[PDB]
Amino acid sequence: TVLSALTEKFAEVFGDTKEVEYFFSPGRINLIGEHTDYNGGYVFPASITIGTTGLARLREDKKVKLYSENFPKLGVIEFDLDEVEKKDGELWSNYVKGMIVMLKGAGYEIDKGFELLIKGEIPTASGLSSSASLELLVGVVLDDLFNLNVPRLELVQLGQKTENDYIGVNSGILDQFAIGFGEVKKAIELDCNTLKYEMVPVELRDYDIVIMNTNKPRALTESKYNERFAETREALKRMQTRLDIQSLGELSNEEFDANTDLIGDETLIKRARHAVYENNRTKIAQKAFVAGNLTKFGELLNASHASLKDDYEVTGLELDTLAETAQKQAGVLGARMTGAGFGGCAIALVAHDNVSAFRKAVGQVYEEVVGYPASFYVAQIGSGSTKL
Ligand SMILES: OC[C@H]1O[C@H](O)[C@H](O)[C@@H](O)[C@H]1O
């Protein structure tokens, strides 16, 4: 269907539809381990079904044409294979340029032009990783048309590199890895420090993963994020004077706790603390998950939420409203914000049968409180990016 839609939307915009190829790159959620990725910690994310889809083909020439069903008002975008280096304001093609730029930089050669049509179910500021989906979409597309044999990991590090180096957004490999390594009904246990990971099948029993979007209108600016990154780095530096660690992730909670003096600043102390605690927490939480102790698991979820609420300070009235109200509900294991923070989505582990009611009970409070409405969706675990 959708394709048919896309498909027919391609000849229009682009004329024909010959030798065209279909791709898809999902979005993701992090079950646990937030703001650890860039602090040498573990993460427990999963790819969802909502993602980004692309129809594209090779060109005759070295020109690049792009259409985005989500922003039709730009009409078509083009550039030739030689402006990849110069961004264009905050346009979407930027992600396409960067990837090309990164791709080439790794020795890969994108010698021709091509066409690209995309549609993405991932909400602009959902916190569900729209950038990474796209980067990865491009990744696999380029990887396919130009028949490169880009290893997933590189592909992934390249997408992170674009975000970071080109787009200019600070981050860890969190989104790229999940999206890149996604597997149907599987979550990824990843050690960010070593890039060693484990695929974990999602085994929730009668529980569903309910995604709650604050729908909070906010400035897609990203400084608070950038400060965090800043902050912990500093803390880490201070720690490094007397400590032989490459990241905050190396520290036991006790070890951290004993050395807070190295830091001194109260706020710095909180951030890094959140960085330490969170990492260890993930470790244990994932085992719980693995052990089928959904309960302990859910309690840990709640715990991640408060650390983020209190020590790292990235939640907010909205995020807190959702999670906490959600926790209050019956047939709810625990709940927390997922992703960056500062709005976006939260998730909950809720009894399949209590879901419909949960949405209502929880939304109500929210609207009341936040004044506005939240959005509910049940997560659906799918595969990472691919040529399908
Ligand atoms: O866990 C917090 C999370 O926030 C954003 O989504 C970043 O892009 C991820 O790399 C990660 O740092």
Residue type (1 letter), 263: I
Atom from ligand 1 closest to the CA of residue 37: 12
31 among annotated binding-site residues: no
Q: How far apart are CA 5 and CA 13, in angstroms?
A: 12
- The answer to whether 294 touches 190, Cβ cutoff 8 Å, is no
Query: In whole angstroms, how far apart are CA 184 and each of 48, 175, 190?
Result: 9, 16, 17
Q: Which residue's C-alpha comes closest to atom 1 of ligand 1?
A: 34
Q: Between vectors from CA 100 to CA 98 and to CA 101, what angle results, nearest 5°?
A: 60
**Which class is 202-378 in CATH?**
alpha beta
Please give the structure tokens belonging to residue 101.
Answer: 């730029």
Q: Which residues contact 287 (CB under 8 A, 6 or more apart)?
A: none
Which sequence spans correspond to the domains of the chain?
1-201+379-388, 202-378
Q: Is the CB of 175 under 6 A from ligand 1?
A: yes
Q: Is the CB of 308 under 6 A from ligand 1?
A: no
- To one decimal, the resolution in angstroms is 2.1
Query: In whole angstroms, how far apart are CA 147 and each of 58, 150, 158?
Result: 11, 9, 17
Q: How many CB atoms lie within 10 A of CB 6?
A: 19
* DSSP assignment letter at 330: T
- The answer to whether 193 touches 37, Cβ cutoff 8 Å, is no
Closest by CA to 44, choosing from 58, 29, 57, is 29
Strands 63-68 and 114-120, bridge-based pairing: parallel
What does residue 50 show for φ and ψ, rounded to 5 degrees?
-65, 125
* DSSP assignment letter at 168: -
Query: In whole angstroms, how far apart are CA 188 and each of 97, 175, 289, 354, 367?
Result: 29, 11, 12, 27, 34
175: annotated active-site residue: yes
The enclosing H or E element of 37 equals none
Q: Is the CB of 39 under 6 A from ligand 1?
A: no
Atom from ligand 1 closest to the CA of residue 38: 12
Where does 251-358 show beta strands of DSSP type E? 332-337, 345-351
Q: At what angle do helices 130-145 and 93-105 cross, to 10 degrees?
A: 50
Q: Which residues of 159-191 are buried (b: 16+ CB within 10 A; e: fewer)?
A: bbbbbbebbeeebbbbbbbbbbbbbeebbbbbb
Q: How far apart are CA 233 and CA 248, in angstroms?
A: 9
Active-site hit among 61, 111, 144, 175: 175
Q: Which residue's C-alpha comes closest to atom 8 of ligand 1?
A: 171
CA of 44 to the centre of ligand 1 (A): 12
Q: How far apart are CA 348 and CA 322, in angstroms?
A: 9
Q: How many CB atoms lie within 10 A of CB 136?
A: 37
Atom from ligand 1 closest to the CA of residue 30: 1
* DSSP assignment letter at 309: H
Closest by CA to 274, choosing from 336, 329, 217, is 336
* DSSP assignment letter at 349: E
- The answer to whether 56 touches 141, Cβ cutoff 8 Å, is yes
Q: How far apart are CA 295 and CA 356, in angstroms?
A: 21
375 among annotated binding-site residues: no
- The answer to whether 44 touches 304, Cβ cutoff 8 Å, is no
Q: Is the CB of 160 under 6 A from ligand 1?
A: no
Q: Which residues contact 124 (CB under 8 A, 6 or more apart)?
A: 130, 220
- The answer to whether 265 touches 19, Cβ cutoff 8 Å, is no
Q: Is the CB of 340 under 6 A from ligand 1?
A: yes
Where does the chain show beta strands of DSSP type E? 21-32, 42-58, 63-68, 77-80, 114-120, 186-191, 197-201, 207-213, 332-337, 345-351, 375-378
* DSSP assignment letter at 164: I
Q: What's the order of all strands across the beta sheet hosting 375-378? A: 332-337, 345-351, 207-213, 375-378
* DSSP assignment letter at 167: I
Method used experimentally: X-ray
Q: Which residue has the tokens 């912990």?
A: 232
Question: Domain 1-201+379-388 belongs to what architecture?
Answer: 2-Layer Sandwich (3.30)
Q: Which residue has the tokens 């939480």?
A: 285
Please give the structure tokens belonging to residue 95.
Answer: 């992600």
* 118 conformational bin, left if phi > 0, alpha if psi -120 to 50, beta if neither: beta
Q: Is 113 helix (H, G, I), strand (E, B) or coil?
A: coil
Q: Is 18 helix (H, G, I), strand (E, B) or coil?
A: coil
Instruction: Report the number of secondary-structure helices (H) and strands (E) in the chain.
Output: 11, 11
- The answer to whether 310 touches 220, Cβ cutoff 8 Å, is no
Task: Kindly calculate the radius of gyration of the chain based on its CA atoms and give it in whole angstroms.
Answer: 21
Closest by CA to 269, choosing from 279, 281, 259, is 259
The enclosing H or E element of 71 equals none
Residue among 171, 311, 315 whose CB has most ligand 1 atoms within 8 A, to mutate = 171
Q: Do domains 1-201+379-388 and 202-378 have the same CATH topology?
A: no
Q: Is the CB of 177 under 6 A from ligand 1?
A: no
Q: How far apart are CA 228 and CA 25, in angstroms?
A: 28
- The answer to whether 102 touches 136, Cβ cutoff 8 Å, is no
